Amino acid sequence: QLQARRLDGIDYNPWVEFVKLASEHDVVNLGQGFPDFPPPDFAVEAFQHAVSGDFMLNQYTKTFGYPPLTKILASFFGELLGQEIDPLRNVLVTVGGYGALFTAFQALVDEGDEVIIIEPFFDCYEPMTMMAGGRPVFVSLKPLGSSSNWQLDPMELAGKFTSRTKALVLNTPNNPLGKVFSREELELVASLCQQHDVVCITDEVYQWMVYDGHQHISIASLPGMWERTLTIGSAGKTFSATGWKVGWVLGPDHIMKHLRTVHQNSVFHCPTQSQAAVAESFEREQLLFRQPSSYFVQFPQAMQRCRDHMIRSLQSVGLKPIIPQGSYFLITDISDFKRKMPDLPGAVDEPYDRRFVKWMIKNKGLVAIPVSIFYSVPHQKHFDHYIRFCFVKDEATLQAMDEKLRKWKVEL
Amino acid sequence: QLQARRLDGIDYNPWVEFVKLASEHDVVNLGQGFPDFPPPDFAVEAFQHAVSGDFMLNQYTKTFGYPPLTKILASFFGELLGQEIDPLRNVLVTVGGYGALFTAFQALVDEGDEVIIIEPFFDCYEPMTMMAGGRPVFVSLKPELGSSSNWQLDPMELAGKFTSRTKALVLNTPNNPLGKVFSREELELVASLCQQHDVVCITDEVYQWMVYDGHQHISIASLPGMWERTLTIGSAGKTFSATGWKVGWVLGPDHIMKHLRTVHQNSVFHCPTQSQAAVAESFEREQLLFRQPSSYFVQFPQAMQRCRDHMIRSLQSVGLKPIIPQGSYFLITDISDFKRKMPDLPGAVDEPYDRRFVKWMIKNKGLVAIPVSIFYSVPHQKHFDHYIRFCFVKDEATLQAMDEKLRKWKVEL
């Protein structure tokens, strides 16, 4: 056959059928995982400055990152992690958090290695593991309810580790659930990674999107964890500018050198001007750190109000929200719908949630993402009764949501 | 071990130390493969427009490309290639030409596959082949001032490189570092063999517009029967003199491209939105002016041909022997006279002469060039150790500075 075997089973696209169906109807799109409003002025202005400034910013920068950006990432995140971070040795700028994840998997995961993935998982973790020859090993969080009460059972997790475990992928705050892992939960993960000599790949893109007094804790800051952790961030998720596609990985040289090898043999450079914009945007937030005018203070407070609005609204039609402590997202249990309306049309073994989302788009004008997309196939039948909404939305979008909900109840 | 076996032998990269030594001396840098002057006004303005326009351009766009960009790529390159290109099935936007290459290799090259690479080659072709489990197989171009056109792709040598295990051949035209623009006859040779053996041609055409002396860029995908077995790669940075934009693309038939889309979906997922909008606007501008005297694709290569000619004249003043290129940003000079007269430059054992010569030239003459041996397979480096690569796509002030270094060197001869 023409194509490489590493592509086996990973062409499957869960997204396309729903975006197409959405495009066909008059919908309020709560499935999109990006803000439908502008980034803050200082971020937009930062990009404007980069594309009008020194003309040489139109040319290549350094392979492992634009130096002013790697300098500020090393300083700012070194303080947060309680670690001395060397920009040249410990920081790599990537094409978003996606590119960072891909670079980590391609550097470290080999044929036969196992990778522990925590369900529900950001969906790419599984096919990226597969493409690198790894065998995904799944552990499921155990389910108004709160994302904090979804438990990572210590015995179940410990039982997943074997001599073949290469890495565990931690995502906190979690997409799609919105769970913010506690210190105790991270100490559990850390203990097992140290016991078994496993690398923790930690996807922290939603670091700043935390609510209700919950604190983001970085596992790399725990005793002994810096030397076995890769920490990933996203400028897009940080500054509400998802189309910038700038991310980074932070970690120790003995691991990062391998990510550098992948990087130099794949993209070689990241774009120069967006990196300058991200550096300037961090400079702004560093200067205003913990102050009332800062984005990292103001924005999660605003989005918490959007969250609360959406929680109230969706209950009005019998959806049961699970209150998230972080991220852009909340999930709603649709079990009551499955009980009252079990026989929705769909394909063989098509989980109920996927059929429900299609029904909801066509009949009610609301888009959500079926949560079964974030589960291993063998677990989708059990975890078939949740859907993911995004509340990081313009106030006009939330008003339009409420209009659809009026129609759902009153025209029913 | 911690790291994946696919990284074996590819952690060595020449570039980080070449930028290092140059940065540390007072020098005219002719080793850098990008312009040291601005992109044209319409391109800079296009990016300014993208970052000051529709606020939603700050958010994700479509996975396989910003639709206005895939639209203009499909219509403009469709015309150039004589092909009906579907933007959704035949175009993928990538992170530069580098990302395009990477995507192609990861989609198609598998353990045990052979990939034919033509020396001198843009250096990443080898490690990207190896990371994908492939076995690089090398064919060497065979070397008045010489001309890049006269470096021959021997038909019998090339034919003998094809086997039942050949998956792909990597064609780069115009070639970096040599500046060779492949002729119709040479492309017909490659095409014949790819059809005979059922091989995919991965064609790196980033320097498409940088052609001189009336030489025509011909795309192998335009030849009979080749669209169905060719991936064609371009780079916005090399097209619009904006290397830091890092936007590229692949063009090809759906039955191959679907596999590149799989790699893309499982790696970066999106390319940045706003630079894609800038590239789309820039191509729209050039398509509207296509073949007209005010177009960048007419004006710019004419301007850079003058810079090329200036450099050819100047470098001869110190005894370097240029090979006249028909395209690209680059020329190479033969340094065999220096090797003969000054053989004993310091260096490691088995360090190729060109690498030693470049270090000596940087420190003592104030000029940076790139040793051409980095564009050869390791077993051939000892035999192709007497060329260095210069970049002439440079501001007038830089070429003036070059001449000031050369005049001092000449007195020191």
Swiss-Prot record, chain A:
Q: Which domain of life is it from?
A: Eukaryota
E.C. code: 2.6.1.7, 4.4.1.13, 2.6.1.64
Q: What is the lineage of its organism?
A: Eukaryota, Metazoa, Chordata, Craniata, Vertebrata
User: In the UniProt record, does the keyword Lyase occur?
Assistant: yes
Q: Which UniProt keywords apply?
A: Aminotransferase, Cytoplasm, Lyase, Pyridoxal phosphate, Transferase
Molecular function terms in GO for this entry? cysteine-S-conjugate beta-lyase activity; glutamine-phenylpyruvate transaminase activity; kynurenine-oxoglutarate transaminase activity; protein homodimerization activity; pyridoxal phosphate binding
CDD domains this protein is in? AAT_like
**What family does this chain come from, according to its entry?**
Belongs to the class-I pyridoxal-phosphate-dependent aminotransferase family.
Q: What does this protein do?
A: Catalyzes the irreversible transamination of the L-tryptophan metabolite L-kynurenine to form kynurenic acid (KA), an intermediate in the tryptophan catabolic pathway which is also a broad spectrum antagonist of the three ionotropic excitatory amino acid receptors among others. Also metabolizes the cysteine conjugates of certain halogenated alkenes and alkanes to form reactive metabolites. Catalyzes the beta-elimination of S-conjugates and Se-conjugates of L-(seleno)cysteine, resulting in the cleavage of the C-S or C-Se bond.
Per its record, the protein catalyses:
L-kynurenine + 2-oxoglutarate = kynurenate + L-glutamate + H2O; 3-phenylpyruvate + L-glutamine = 2-oxoglutaramate + L-phenylalanine; an S-substituted L-cysteine + H2O = a thiol + pyruvate + NH4(+)
Indicate where this protein resides in the cell: Cytoplasm, Cytosol
Q: What is this protein called?
A: Kynurenine--oxoglutarate transaminase 1
Q: Required cofactors, per record? A: pyridoxal 5'-phosphate
Query: Which species is listed as the source?
Result: Homo sapiens
